[PDB]
């Protein structure tokens, strides 16, 4: 009974399992972000050059 | 499409964007265009791939 | 720090880093990350009692 609490008491009590989705979707949105930089070209945008 | 010189390719859809009369283009995170008005009638479109 | 390393001491290579993004903000992420994980280690082969 004192887990069904336990858990039931801290939303951080997950911490352990709840990074390794946070890890992933934080790297992905980088990679994403990443793609407006221009890398010293005229303009991020392939289409339009 | 091609608006005022803007090259892309997606489907045109109907947009329920609120764009002030000033603006033309709406951008996201990726830096890629999503919303665009037209040069001749003054409603407002979305782009998706 | 990236800034000081990359264009330490110069305003004009410090505008030129911001064109390529956000390269050296993962960096301090990735060093930071192992920072903690060492003080870590120290805690669970010595602090058991």
């Given at each position: 009974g004192k887990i069904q609490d336990s858990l039931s008491?801290?939303?951080?009590?997950?911490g352990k399992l709840q990074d390794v989705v946070n890890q992933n979707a934080q790297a992905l949105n980088t990679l994403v972000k990443q793609?407006?930089?221009?890398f010293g070209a005229i303009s991020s945008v392939l289409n339009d050059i | 499409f091609n608006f005022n010189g803007l090259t892309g390719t997606g489907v045109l859809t109907e947009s329920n964007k609120k764009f002030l009369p000033f603006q033309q283009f709406g951008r996201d995170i990726a830096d890629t265009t999503d919303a665009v008005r037209d040069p001749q009638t003054l409603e407002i479109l979305d782009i998706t791939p | 720090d990236c800034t000081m390393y990359i264009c330490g001491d110069s305003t004009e290579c410090s505008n030129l880093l911001?064109?390529?993004?956000?390269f050296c903000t993962q960096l301090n992420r990735a060093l930071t990350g192992i920072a903690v994980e060492q003080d870590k280690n120290t805690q669970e082969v010595f602090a058991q009692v």
């Amino acid at each position: 009974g004192k887990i069904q609490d336990s858990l039931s008491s801290t939303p951080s009590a997950l911490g352990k399992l709840q990074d390794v989705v946070n890890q992933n979707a934080q790297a992905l949105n980088t990679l994403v972000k990443q793609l407006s930089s221009n890398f010293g070209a005229i303009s991020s945008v392939l289409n339009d050059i | 499409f091609n608006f005022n010189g803007l090259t892309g390719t997606g489907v045109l859809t109907e947009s329920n964007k609120k764009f002030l009369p000033f603006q033309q283009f709406g951008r996201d995170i990726a830096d890629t265009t999503d919303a665009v008005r037209d040069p001749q009638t003054l409603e407002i479109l979305d782009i998706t791939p | 720090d990236c800034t000081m390393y990359i264009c330490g001491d110069s305003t004009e290579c410090s505008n030129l880093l911001l064109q390529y993004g956000s390269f050296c903000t993962q960096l301090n992420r990735a060093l930071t990350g192992i920072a903690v994980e060492q003080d870590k280690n120290t805690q669970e082969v010595f602090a058991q009692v």
